[PDB]
Amino acid sequence: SMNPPPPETSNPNKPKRQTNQLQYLLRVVLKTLWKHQFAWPFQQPVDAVKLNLPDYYKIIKTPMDMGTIKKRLENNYYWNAQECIQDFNTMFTNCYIYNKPGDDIVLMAEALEKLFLQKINELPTEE
Ligand SMILES: Cc1noc(C)c1-c1cc(O)cc([C@@H](O)c2ccccc2)c1
């Protein structure tokens, strides 16, 4: 079956703003995760055709990935840091829902999420 369209990264009818927290999310949080040895499976949407996973989009109905997040941060899609944090959280949770505990992909997501939580605990106060 065909992949869905990816999550949107441009919509003029969506309100947005720059905040120092969103700027930290791009310059520190995304940047740090993206270069991790284990980032690559999370750097673009799941291509269920390529991966031969007929059920993926039956199971994962709110897909998200760091490719999408990167474009949203770079293209000023967000209103606040919470929208972006939620996208990370959805990406992580999706991986844990779809796969099994201790699978290599789950261990990889967990490595990224450990780093993510370290970086978010240092989120600047809004200014
Ligand atoms: C992310 C993610 N969540 O569920 C699936 C399925 C993936 C996923 C996305 C991908 O690009 C690739 C793979 C898979 O080839 C794999 C398996 C072990 C270690 C790394 C990679 C899984």
Report all structural domains of the chain as residue ranges with CATH numbers, in order of start: 19-123 (1.20.920.10)
Q: How many helices (H) and strands (E) does the chain have?
A: 6, 0
In whole angstroms, what is the distance from residue 93 CA to residue 99 CA?
10
Experimental method: X-ray
Q: How far is the CA of 64 from the centre of ligand 1 (A)?
A: 13
| 41 Cβ below 6 A of ligand 1 | yes
CA dihedral 95, 23, 83, 14 (to 10 degrees): -120
CB 39 within 8 A of CB 86: no
59, two tokens: 């199971």
In whole angstroms, what is the distance from residue 15 CA to residue 21 CA?
17
Residue 13 CB coordination number (10 Å): 4
In whole angstroms, what is the distance from residue 77 CA to residue 73 CA?
6
Residue 109 contacts by C-beta under 8 Å, 6 or more apart in sequence? 42, 91, 92, 95, 96
AA letter at 110: E
For the CA of 42, the closest atom of ligand 1 is 1
108, two tokens: 């990889």
Q: How far is the CA of 17 from the centre of ligand 1 (A)?
A: 33
- Going by alpha carbons, the residue nearest to atom 2 of ligand 1 is 95
Question: Resolution in angstroms for this experimental structure?
Answer: 1.8
- Going by alpha carbons, the residue nearest to atom 17 of ligand 1 is 105
